[PDB]
Design a protein around this motif. Sequence first.
Motif, short mmCIF file in Angstrom:
data_model
loop_
_atom_site.label_atom_id
_atom_site.label_comp_id
_atom_site.label_asym_id
_atom_site.label_seq_id
_atom_site.Cartn_x
_atom_site.Cartn_y
_atom_site.Cartn_z
N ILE A 23 11.48 93.77 33.29
CA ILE A 23 10.86 93.77 31.98
C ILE A 23 10.64 95.29 31.10
O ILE A 23 10.83 96.30 31.96
CB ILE A 23 9.13 93.17 32.17
N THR A 24 10.04 95.10 29.99
CA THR A 24 9.91 96.46 29.26
C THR A 24 8.73 96.79 28.86
O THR A 24 7.74 95.94 29.39
CB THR A 24 10.58 96.02 27.82
N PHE A 25 8.20 97.84 28.26
CA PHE A 25 6.73 98.19 27.77
C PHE A 25 6.27 97.03 26.99
O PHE A 25 5.13 96.77 26.88
CB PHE A 25 6.83 99.62 27.35
N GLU A 26 7.31 96.61 26.02
CA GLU A 26 6.83 95.72 24.92
C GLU A 26 6.30 94.38 25.77
O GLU A 26 5.42 93.81 25.29
CB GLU A 26 7.87 95.43 23.80
N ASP A 27 7.09 94.03 26.74
CA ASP A 27 6.60 92.95 27.61
C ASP A 27 5.13 92.96 28.03
O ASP A 27 4.33 92.02 28.28
CB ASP A 27 7.68 92.64 28.79
N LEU A 28 4.98 94.20 28.58
CA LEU A 28 3.63 94.83 29.02
C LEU A 28 2.46 94.59 28.03
O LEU A 28 1.42 94.07 28.35
CB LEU A 28 3.64 95.83 29.72
N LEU A 29 2.89 95.19 26.96
CA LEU A 29 2.15 95.23 25.71
C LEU A 29 1.66 93.35 25.39
O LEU A 29 0.63 93.32 25.27
CB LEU A 29 2.79 95.67 24.59
N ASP A 30 2.71 92.80 25.34
CA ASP A 30 2.47 91.15 25.42
C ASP A 30 1.79 90.61 26.31
O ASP A 30 0.75 89.47 26.11
CB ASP A 30 3.98 90.44 25.27
N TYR A 31 1.64 91.18 27.46
CA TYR A 31 0.99 90.46 28.59
C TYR A 31 -0.44 90.86 28.66
O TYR A 31 -1.33 90.07 28.93
CB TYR A 31 1.66 90.95 29.98
N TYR A 32 -0.57 92.16 28.39
CA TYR A 32 -1.73 92.71 28.57
C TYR A 32 -2.92 92.74 27.19
O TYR A 32 -4.16 92.58 27.34
CB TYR A 32 -2.03 94.30 29.08
N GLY A 33 -2.17 92.89 26.14
CA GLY A 33 -2.71 93.05 24.94
C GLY A 33 -3.27 94.74 24.92
O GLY A 33 -2.86 95.45 25.84
N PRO A 34 -3.97 95.07 23.75
CA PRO A 34 -4.42 96.52 23.83
C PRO A 34 -5.52 96.91 24.81
O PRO A 34 -5.66 98.13 25.28
CB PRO A 34 -4.99 96.73 22.47
#
Lengths: 12, 77, 75
Positions: free
Chosen positions: A1-12
């Motif tokens: 996974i990427t950082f964008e995947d983490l952004l998508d998973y967690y939100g801000p």
Amino acid sequence: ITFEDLLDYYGP
Amino acid sequence: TSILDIRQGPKEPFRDYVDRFYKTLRAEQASQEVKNWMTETLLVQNANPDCKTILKALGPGATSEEMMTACQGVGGP
Amino acid sequence: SILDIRQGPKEPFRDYVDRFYKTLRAEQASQEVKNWMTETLLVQNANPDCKTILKALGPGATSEEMMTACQGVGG
């Protein structure tokens, strides 16, 4: 996974 | 205050480790592309032995949800 | 990106390392991350002939040590 995947998973 | 400081404990839930990794990476100074590469490489590299094994066997195509669930049986609360 | 600075198959190692450091100048990163990039990413992006040598140097190898080991590759 990427950082964008983490952004998508967690939100801000 | 550095992503290089983030390493999973032997008993640390994978979910807790990813949380720390994410929050630290949010605060890190880097381009989005470098943050993506940091996630693709460091997150697995710095995982504990069993989570690292699971993640590598899953492969780089695994989603976040699958990844979390695949590792949830390793370690303590 | 620094991620994409990659050694050509017959590019002198010194030329490649020079390109890598030049790109690093304007790369947004902590000096800690930049240093780590020169120890790891610089090796990963090296050509097959240089990478083989660099991997033998072992983790902890600095770009100075890498230069000594690889500058003479390809004559």
